[PDB]
Every structure is written in C-alpha cells, then in structure tokens.
Amino acid sequence: PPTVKILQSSCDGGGHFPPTIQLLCLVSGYTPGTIQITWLEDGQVMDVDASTQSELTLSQKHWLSDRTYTCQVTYQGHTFEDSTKKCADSNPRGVSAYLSRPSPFDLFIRKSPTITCLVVDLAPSKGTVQLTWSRASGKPVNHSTRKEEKQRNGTLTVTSTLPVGTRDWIEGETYQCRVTHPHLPRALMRSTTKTSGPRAAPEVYAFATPEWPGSRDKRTLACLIQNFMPEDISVQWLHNEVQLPDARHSTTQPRKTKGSGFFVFSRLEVTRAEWEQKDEFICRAVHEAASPSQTVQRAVSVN
Amino acid sequence: TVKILQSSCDGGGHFPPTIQLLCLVSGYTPGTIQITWLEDGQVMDVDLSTASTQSELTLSQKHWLSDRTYTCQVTYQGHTFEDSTKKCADSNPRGVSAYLSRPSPFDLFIRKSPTITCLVVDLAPSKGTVQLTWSRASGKPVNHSTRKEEKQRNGTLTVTSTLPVGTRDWIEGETYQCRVTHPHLPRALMRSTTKTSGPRAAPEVYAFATPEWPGSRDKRTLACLIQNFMPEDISVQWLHNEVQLPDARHSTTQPRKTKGSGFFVFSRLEVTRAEWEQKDEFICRAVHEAASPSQTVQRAVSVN
Amino acid sequence: KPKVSLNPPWNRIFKGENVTLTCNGNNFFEVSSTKWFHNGSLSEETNSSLNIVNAKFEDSGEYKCQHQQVNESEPVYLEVFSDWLLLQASAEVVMEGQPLFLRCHGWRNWDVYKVIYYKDGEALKYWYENHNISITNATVEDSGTYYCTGKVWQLDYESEPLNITVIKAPREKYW
Ligand SMILES: *[C@@H]1O[C@H](CO)[C@@H](O[C@@H]2O[C@H](CO)[C@@H](O[C@@H]3O[C@H](CO[C@H]4O[C@H](CO)[C@@H](O)[C@H](O)[C@@H]4O)[C@@H](O)[C@H](O[C@H]4O[C@H](CO)[C@@H](O)[C@H](O)[C@@H]4O)[C@@H]3O)[C@H](O)[C@H]2NC(C)=O)[C@H](O)[C@H]1NC(C)=O
Numbered sequence: 157p158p159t160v161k162i163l164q165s166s167c168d169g170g171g172h173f174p175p176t177i178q179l180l181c182l183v184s185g186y187t188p189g190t191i192q193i194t195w196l197e198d199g200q201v202m203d204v205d206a207s208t209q210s211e212l213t214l215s216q217k218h219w220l221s222d223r224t225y226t227c228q229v230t231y232q233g234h235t236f237e238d239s240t241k242k243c244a245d246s247n248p249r250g251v252s253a254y255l256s257r258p259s260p261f262d263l264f265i266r267k268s269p270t271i272t273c274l275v276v277d278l279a280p281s282k283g284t285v286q287l288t289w290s291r292a293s294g295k296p297v298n299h300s301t302r303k304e305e306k307q308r309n310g311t312l313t314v315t316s317t318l319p320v321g322t323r324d325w326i327e328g329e330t331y332q333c334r335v336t337h338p339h340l341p342r343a344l345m346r347s348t349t350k351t352s353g354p355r356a357a358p359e360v361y362a363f364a365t366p367e368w369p370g371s372r373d374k375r376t377l378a379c380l381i382q383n384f385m386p387e388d389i390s391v392q393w394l395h396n397e398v399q400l401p402d403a404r405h406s407t408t409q410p411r412k413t414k415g416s417g418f419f420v421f422s423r424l425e426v427t428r429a430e431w432e433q434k435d436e437f438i439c440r441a442v443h444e445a446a447s448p449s450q451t452v453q454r455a456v457s458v459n
Numbered sequence: 460t461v462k463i464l465q466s467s468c469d470g471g472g473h474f475p476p477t478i479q480l481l482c483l484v485s486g487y488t489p490g491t492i493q494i495t496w497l498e499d500g501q502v503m504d505v506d507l508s509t510a511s512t513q514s515e516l517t518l519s520q521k522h523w524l525s526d527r528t529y530t531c532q533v534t535y536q537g538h539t540f541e542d543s544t545k546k547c548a549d550s551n552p553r554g555v556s557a558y559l560s561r562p563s564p565f566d567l568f569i570r571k572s573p574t575i576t577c578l579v580v581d582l583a584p585s586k587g588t589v590q591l592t593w594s595r596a597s598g599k600p601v602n603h604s605t606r607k608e609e610k611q612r613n614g615t616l617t618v619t620s621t622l623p624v625g626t627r628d629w630i631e632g633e634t635y636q637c638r639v640t641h642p643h644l645p646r647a648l649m650r651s652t653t654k655t656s657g658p659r660a661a662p663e664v665y666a667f668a669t670p671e672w673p674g675s676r677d678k679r680t681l682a683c684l685i686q687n688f689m690p691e692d693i694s695v696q697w698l699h700n701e702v703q704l705p706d707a708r709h710s711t712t713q714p715r716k717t718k719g720s721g722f723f724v725f726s727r728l729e730v731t732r733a734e735w736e737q738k739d740e741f742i743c744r745a746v747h748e749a750a751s752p753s754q755t756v757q758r759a760v761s762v763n
Numbered sequence: 764k765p766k767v768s769l770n771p772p773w774n775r776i777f778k779g780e781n782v783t784l785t786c787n788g789n790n791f792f793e794v795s796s797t798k799w800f801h802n803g804s805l806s807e808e809t810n811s812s813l814n815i816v817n818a819k820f821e822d823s824g825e826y827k828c829q830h831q832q833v834n835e836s837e838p839v840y841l842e843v844f845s846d847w848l849l850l851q852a853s854a855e856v857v858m859e860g861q862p863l864f865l866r867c868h869g870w871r872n873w874d875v876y877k878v879i880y881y882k883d884g885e886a887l888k889y890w891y892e893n894h895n896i897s898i899t900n901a902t903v904e905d906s907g908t909y910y911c912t913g914k915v916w917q918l919d920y921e922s923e924p925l926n927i928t929v930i931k932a933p934r935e936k937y938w
C-alpha cells in the first residue's frame with residue numbers, strides 16, 4: 157500500500173491549457189516486487205503510458221471533453237486507484253434514465269428475457285431514487301433485482317433488472333420504468349415495447365482476411381450481417397461448437413443501410429494455435445426473423 | 460528546461476484541500492542554480508540548488524480560488540526563465556463553446572490543401588463583431604481565414620473560421636491557436652491544435668467482395684477492413700476504374716481500438732449488377748500518415 | 764369593485780411557493796369584513812391578506828374577495844405547476860399600457876442557463892443566464908404563444924406554452 161498521486165500540467169499565462177497535457181502518476185514508498193499501472197479512460201483500456209512515474213500525453217480535445225482518467229496500480233494485495241479530470245466549478249449533470257430492450261440471445265435462445273433500467277449521474281448525498289416497474293395492461297410483474305454502484309467520478313449508478321415472460325414480450329406488451337427522487341419535480345418515465353414494422357431474415361457472411369507477412373501469429377476473422385429488420389440482433393462466435401467469451405470479439409452497433417435495412421460487423425482475433433487445429437469457426441446471428449430457429453450461421457476455416 | 464505541475468482535481472472535478480505546486484527544473488549543467496517563487500510580482504520563495512525543486516508550494520482553499528498568478532523563475536548563471544500558473548480558466552465561459560477541428564489525411568496528403576476550422580457556438584447577438592485570431596505557437600506568418608457568421612433559429616450565433624495550412628508545417632508538429640475575444644466573454648476563448656504524438660504503424664488493408672446471395676441477384680457488397688494503424692485518424696475511399704466514388708456510396712465506421720496496439724475500421728460499399736458484370740476492379744484506399752512514402756495503401760476487389 | 768392583487772405577481776407558481784392575495788378597495792374596512800372565496804365555497808380568513816404558504820395542488824382555482832358588502836370582486840385564477848421550467852407572466856389580459864413581464868422560473872431557486880424565449884416558433888431572445896422580458900408599453904403585435912427553454916443541471920428542459928393577449932384600444936373614436 158504505497159502513496160499514489162497524480163499531477164496535472166497547469167495552465168500557463170492567463171489560464172490557458174497547454175496544447176499537450178502531461179499527466180504524471182507517481183507511486184512512491186513501496187517494496188518493489190511487482191509494478192503494474194493502468195491508465196483507464198472512463199473505465200476503458202489504454203496502451204502503455206522506491207518511486208515510479210507514469211506519463212500520459214493528452215490533446216486539448218480529449219482533456220476538454222470532460223473525461224475521467226483512472227490511474228490504477230496493482231500491488232498483489234489490492235488494485236488501488238486514483239482519479240483525475242477537468243474540474244468544473246459547479247452545476248453537476250442531472251439524473252439520467254435509460255431503458256434497454258432484451259437481447260435476442262436471451263429472448264429466443266436462453267428463453268429468459270431481462271429488461272434493464274439504468275439510472276446514472278446520481279448524487280452520493282441524499283440519493284434514494286425509487287424504481288417502479290409497471291405494465292401497460294396492468295398485469296402483475298415479476299420480482300426485480302436492484303443494485304447500486306459507486307463510479308469513478310463519484311456519481312451513483314442504479315441498475316434494475318426485471319425478467320420478462322417470453323410470451324408477454326412476443327405479443328407486444330409495453331413495460332414502463334418510473335424513477336422517483338425527492339428533489340426531482342417530476343418522475344422520470346421510460347417505456348420499452350417491441351419493434352413493430354417489417355421483418356427480414358438477416359444475411360450473414362463470415363470470412364477470413366488473408367495473412368499479412370508481418371505477423372505470422374494472429375488472424376482476423378470477421379462477419380458481416382446485413383439486410384435485417386428490425387435492428388435488434390445478437391452476434392456470437394462458436395469454436396468447435398463452443399461459445400467464445402464476449403470479450404474476444406467486437407461487434408459494431410447497428411447502422412441503417414442505404415437500401416432497406418441494417419448492417420453490423422463483427423471482428424475477432426485468433427492465435428495460430430487455433431488456426432493449426434483446422435477447427436470450424438462459426439459466426440452466428442440471432443434475430444427475430446432468422447427462420448426457422450431464430451438463428452442463422454456461417455462457417456469458415458483454412459483454405 | 461523548466462516545467463510546472465499542479466495538484467489534480469479529484470473525482471468529479473473538486474479541488475482537493477492543500478493544493479501542491481511542483482516546479483520541475485531539469486536538463487542543465489550543474490552549477491549555481493537558483494529558483495524563485497513569485498506571487499503577483501512579489502516574493503514567495505527563494506531556493507538554491509547545485510534535480511528539481513526541493514520545496515513545493517503548499518496552499519489552502521483560499522488562494523487557489525480567484526485570480527492569483529504564481530510564477531516559477533530560474534535565474535541560473537544570469538540566465539532567466541519564467542513560467543506562470545493560474546487556476547485554469549473556464550473552457551466554455553458563459554456556456555459559449557469552441558471546437559477546433561483537424562485536417563483529414565485525405566486533404567492533408569492527396570488534396571494537399573489542409574484546412575483547420577474553428578467553430579464558436581452558443582454565442583449571442585450583439586452590437587459588434589466576434590474578433591477571432593489565428594496564431595502559431597512557434598510564431599510564423601498566417602494565411603488569413605474565411606470567417607463566416609450564422610443566425611441559427613434558436614437565437615444563438617455561430618462563428619466559423621477556416622484557415623488553410625501547409626502540409627509540411629502540420630507534419631513537423633506545429634501548433635495552431637484560435638483566439639476569440641468577444642466582448643461578452645470575460646477574457647477570451649483559447650483553443651490549440653497539434654498533430655497527435657505517439658507510435659506510428661502502417662495500416663493493413665483487406666478488401667474483398669461478399670459471395671453471391673441467392674435472394675436478390677442484383678446488388679453485391681464490397682467490404683474493406685483496415686486495421687493495425689496508429690494514430691486513430693484515417694481516410695477511407697472507394698475507386699472505380701480510377702475515379703473516386705461519391706462519399707455517400709459507402710459507409711465507414713468510426714475508429715475503434717483492437718485487442719492489442721492499433722485501431723480498426725470497416726468500410727461497406729454497395730455495387731449494382733451492371734457495374735459488377737463489367738468485370739471492373741474496385742479499389743479500397745486508406746490514407747494514413749504512417750503509410751510511407753505515398754501515405755496511401757490500397758487493395759483490389761474483383762469477381763473470381 | 765375591489766381588485767385582488769397577488770404579492771408576488773405571476774399567479775402561475777410552483778408547488779410549495781408563496782403568494783399573498785389582497786384586495787385594497789376604496790374603503791379600509793379590513794376588520795372582520797373581508798370574505799375570501801375559493802371555488803364556490805367560504806374560507807376561514809377574515810383579514811384582507813390571505814397568505815398561501817406551501818401551495819399544494821388543492822390550493823389552485825379561482826379566488827374572490829367580498830370586502831364588506833359591495834357586489835363582488837373579479838376572480839383571480841391561481842394555477843400551481845410542478846414542471847422543471849415554468850413561464851411566469853405579470854398579466855395575460857394586459858392592456859396596451861402597463862408593461863408586460865416574462866420570467867423563466869426553474870424548479871426551486873435552481874440556476875437556469877442558455878435561456879431562450881419563443882414567439883410562436885420564432886425565438887425571441889437567448890441569454891447565457893436567466894433573464895427577464897420587460898416589454899414596456901406592449902403594442903398589438905406582442906401576443907401569442909410564449910415558452911422558454913433552458914438548461915438545468917446541464918440538461919435541457921422546455922416550459923409549457925402560455926397564451927398572452929394584449930387587445931386593442933378601448934374607444935379611440937374622438938370623431
Ligand atoms: C461517471 O461515470 C459513469 C460511468 O463510470 C458515467 O455513466 C455513464 O453515463 C453514460 C451517459 O449517461 C452512459 O451511456 C449510456 O449507456 C446506456 C447503457 O446501454 C449500454 O450498456 C448496457 C449495459 O449496461 C448494454 O446492455 C447496452 O447494450 C449498451 O451497450 C446506453 O443505452 C445509452 O445509449 C443511449 O444514449 C445515447 C446518447 O448518450 C444514444 O446515442 C443511444 O442511441 C441511446 O439512446 C448511453 O450510451 C453509460 O452507460 C454510463 N456508464 C455506465 C457504466 O453505465 C457518468 O456519466 C459519469 N459522470 C459524468 C458527470 O460524466
């Protein structure tokens with residue numbers, strides 16, 4: 157448990173930010189057995205940069221965008237963290253509410269839909285937002301799980317997950333999330349329903365880009381899913397019929413194609429170890445119109 | 460070399476108590492090195508060294524709240540160096556916002572006419588003009604600006620200023636400064652832009668055609684993945700028989716970080732059967748600063 | 764006919780605010796002669812000043828006063844709101860003379876920034892902070908729907924439309 161501090165390049169002249177800002181994370185007073193510093197950008201992942209100093213170079217736009225940077229040191233016992241941000245005099249952001257539709261994977265494959273109500277930009281002091289779940293038809297709802305989390309910038313996050321009957325959601329039942337706060341004049345109303353309209357089966361194309369001579373280690377597998385309506389789609393990757401972790405692949409958010417529908421891109425990086433095994437790599441897309449079993453898949457391999 | 464560091468604002472942006480100021484003086488021949496601290500032109504601290512400062516400025520939440528200027532000075536062997544510090548001014552005074560864009564690689568290397576745009580928004584109408592100035596940190600002649608005013612419906616004003624710059628100047632790492640001195644704004648709006656620093660990696664481009672769907676035998680989709688490039692800026696273009704297609708014909712995703720060091724972008728284009736059945740070659744081109752020497756890397760797409 | 768005045772003005776108020784209704788009248792028979800009427804009812808106030816504190820939703824409605832006998836007083840409509848932003852006007856049947864006052868009041872005394880007033884689609888005035896409208900001797904064209912949009916707690920909010928009529932000259936004539 158050493159002393160960890162962060163120093164920021166102050167303004168010059170009449171309070172002008174330098175064009176390049178150098179944050180200096182100092183970790184002092186420790187027994188050196190293992191040293192590891194991460195530079196999270198609002199919880200994300202950043203590349204690489206007694207007493208140790210870590211340097212972070214930032215542009216004007218990134219610093220002025222009001223983003224919190226977390227310098228986290230891992231010291232076996234724990235994973236201590238600091239925080240740094242552009243500091244505003246007053247006027248914190250007000251309470252925000254969001255409602256998320258169930259994923260197609262949990263709607264058609266696992267048959268256990270769960271809707272999530274998210275309350276963000278709360279206040280640590282006098283924050284007791286009450287979340288109420290209601291239905292348009294007035295039928296009783298299932299028990300919901302509510303959790304509270306402390307973020308890096310000091311604000312609170314309230315997550316309420318409620319399971320939804322598959323038959324009720326398929327028919328078109330509308331669910332409503334009510335957020336009530338003593339200071340708030342009105343109650344935050346959020347509504348989630350189905351995506352009515354035209355339906356088209358997704359078209360899935362999996363492929364392997366060719367090997368760059370520079371790196372004989374890793375291959376980039378990718379999958380384009382186009383011409384599907386509505387925009388609710390789940391993308392998965394299967395290796396020898398085993399689902400890979402969600403952190404292995406990255407899927408682009410749905411975007412409306414020019415002609416009639418939506419298109420998404422999924423990209424995954426594989427090591428030569430799985431490439432030598434000659435296994436069949438399957439890109440799978442779960443969509444409401446991906447008949448017959450709400451699923452369309454493609455397979456790629458060597459050659 | 461003399462630099463300065465304050466105490467970082469904690470969490471949501473609240474000033475921690477007992478603000479600490481650090482003056483880093485380094486890169487010198489050892490000798491009679493003397494460092495002084497000044498408060499609004501007065502005397503605050505005098506230091507002597509033969510290493511940065513051995514004494515750091517400890518304040519309270521009474522001084523680091525208003526217009527107070529703290530100066531770190533080095534008077535080493537008759538050579539005087541000065542650095543000034545103050546509570547960092549508001550980035551958006553009175554809510555007026557300033558955005559300083561950067562030239563794309565496309566007009567940085569191919570069009571050879573880079574342009575930087577300073578956009579001042581959320582202003583208010585007044586009897587006068589919005590004085591905007593373009594400067595360079597090193598200090599060099601400027602190439603004018605195409606100033607333009609707007610009268611948005613919500614009652615707010617808008618000032619746009621486009622300045623053409625030399626590609627050689629931007630490549631070397633020059634800093635371009637946009638200054639706004641509207642009378643409503645207390646002091647000024649001070650924006651700076653500079654080419655991103657860090658490692659550089661030549662992009663890898665893989666362009667291909669999707670195989671033919673049995674549903675509709677009219678349109679095909681050409682997809683181009685550009686990965687392993689640093690920094691994050693790039694331009695993606697599609698060429699048919701060596702003439703550039705309109706930007707509306709293709710969709711390019713925003714840059715995203717890969718598992719390792721580098722970014723990746725997907726570009727999707729739609730082609731008709733008449734264009735495709737002519738057996739023409741479709742070029743996917745990525746313009747990036749690290750793709751030496753032409754700064755462009757392109758690949759080809761064709762049937763069978 | 765006594766006239767009931769509200770201190771402060773802008774009968775459009777938030778829940779929990781303060782008003783004081785008082786009809787002056789030519790006479791000064793305040794002692795046990797002022798009867799205050801809510802919607803078709805009789806209140807329990809005898810003084811000429813009726814103070815509403817912590818104005819609930821039930822305190823809204825039409826108010827009248829009956830200082831001694833006379834005939835009656837002109838009813839005043841008091842409406843309580845609970846929105847983030849409310850447009851408060853000094854009067855809505857304002858003559859061509861006495862000025863017109865407009866204020867964008869947020870919930871509680873919360874600072875409102877980037878306040879924009881509207882004039883039935885066309886924006887009237889935008890200011891960085893909260894600002895009033897003080898139209899002195901409003902003419903005929905100063906009528907229609909008014910509403911203000913602001914930024915409270917760094918979030919955008921919009922008020923409710925308010926219809927303001929200024930009417931024309933009473934008689935003129937003079938042959
Ligand atoms: C302090 O730090 C916290 C986090 O550490 C910040 O909280 C974040 O706030 C932002 C904006 O309020 C949140 O962004 C929103 O996230 C929603 C969540 O959906 C995603 O996440 C769920 C899992 O939780 C996934 O299942 C889902 O598929 C999504 O991937 C989105 O739904 C929101 O999108 C909506 O709004 C955007 C505009 O913002 C629209 O463009 C979209 O179309 C859509 O309508 C949105 O992206 C973020 O999620 C919060 N973090 C966390 C961890 O929840 C605080 O804001 C920060 N404090 C300050 C003052 O900055």
Ligand SMILES: *[C@@H]1O[C@H](CO)[C@@H](O[C@@H]2O[C@H](CO)[C@@H](O[C@@H]3O[C@H](CO[C@H]4O[C@H](CO)[C@@H](O)[C@H](O)[C@@H]4O)[C@@H](O)[C@H](O[C@H]4O[C@H](CO)[C@@H](O)[C@H](O)[C@@H]4O)[C@@H]3O)[C@H](O)[C@H]2NC(C)=O)[C@H](O)[C@H]1NC(C)=O
Pocket residue numbers: 217221556558560578580581611612613615617877
């Ligand atoms: C009155 O109405 C006018 C117009 O109706 C509003 O003016 C608009 O204000 C918005 C908000 O500031 C402006 O949008 C901003 O654009 C900046 C510059 O964008 C560049 O890049 C895009 C491509 O992404 C180009 O298309 C564009 O031409 C510019 O070259 C952005 O930097 C702003 O923020 C973005 O970046 C940050 C990160 O720095 C992100 O966090 C943001 O989410 C966002 O992505 C912002 O998007 C818009 O340009 C203005 N219109 C104009 C000038 O015509 C007034 O705001 C409005 N007044 C009030 C009081 O509401």
Ligand SMILES: *[C@@H]1O[C@H](CO)[C@@H](O[C@@H]2O[C@H](CO)[C@@H](O[C@@H]3O[C@H](CO)[C@@H](O)[C@H](O[C@H]4O[C@H](CO)[C@@H](O)[C@H](O)[C@@H]4O)[C@@H]3O)[C@H](O)[C@H]2NC(C)=O)[C@H](O)[C@H]1NC(C)=O
Pocket residue numbers: 341342343801802820821822823824825842843845
């Ligand atoms: C004298 O007459 C007036 C009417 O001229 C009367 O005022 C009315 O009171 C009722 C309440 O009895 C108001 O009706 C609504 O009641 C619900 C609660 O049941 C409230 O929630 C309403 O307020 C808002 O609530 C939400 C915010 O929490 C809003 O989203 C919603 O849209 C509502 O606007 C509201 O109070 C009725 O609106 C008023 N009348 C007017 C014109 O406002 C008064 O009660 C009468 N006097 C007596 C003594 O009865």
Ligand SMILES: *[C@@H]1O[C@H](CO[C@@H]2O[C@@H](C)[C@@H](O)[C@@H](O)[C@@H]2O)[C@@H](O[C@@H]2O[C@H](CO)[C@@H](O)[C@H](O)[C@H]2NC(C)=O)[C@H](O)[C@H]1NC(C)=O
Pocket residue numbers: 771772853864866893894895
């Ligand atoms: C906007 O106006 C309010 C109140 O306006 C008052 O009432 C009107 C009918 C008209 O007569 C105006 O000239 C009056 O000023 C202002 O709030 C007042 O602020 C002063 C100064 O602090 C205070 O003494 C008064 O008590 C306040 N009025 C009330 C009713 O509390 C306000 O300052 C004006 N400007 C804004 C909001 O930017």
Ligand SMILES: *[C@@H]1O[C@H](CO)[C@@H](O[C@@H]2O[C@H](CO)[C@@H](O)[C@H](O)[C@H]2NC(C)=O)[C@H](O)[C@H]1NC(C)=O
Pocket residue numbers: 779780781816817
């Ligand atoms: C004016 O409004 C304030 C709050 O908006 C209230 O003040 C209360 O006044 C009564 C006396 O009338 C006191 O007994 C309370 O202690 C006050 N509350 C406070 C100060 O929080 C009340 O609604 C109005 N005040 C007056 C004097 O009319």
Ligand SMILES: *[C@@H]1O[C@H](CO)[C@@H](O)[C@H](O)[C@H]1NC(C)=O
Pocket residue numbers: 860861899900
């Ligand atoms: C209107 O403003 C005041 C208030 O009535 C009045 O004294 C003034 O003479 C009027 N001005 C005009 C131009 O009518």
Ligand SMILES: *[C@@H]1O[C@H](CO)[C@@H](O)[C@H](O)[C@H]1NC(C)=O
Pocket residue numbers: 907908924926
């Ligand atoms: C305001 O007055 C106009 C003109 O008479 C009318 O069209 C409009 O409906 C009115 N608005 C309300 C809310 O009564």
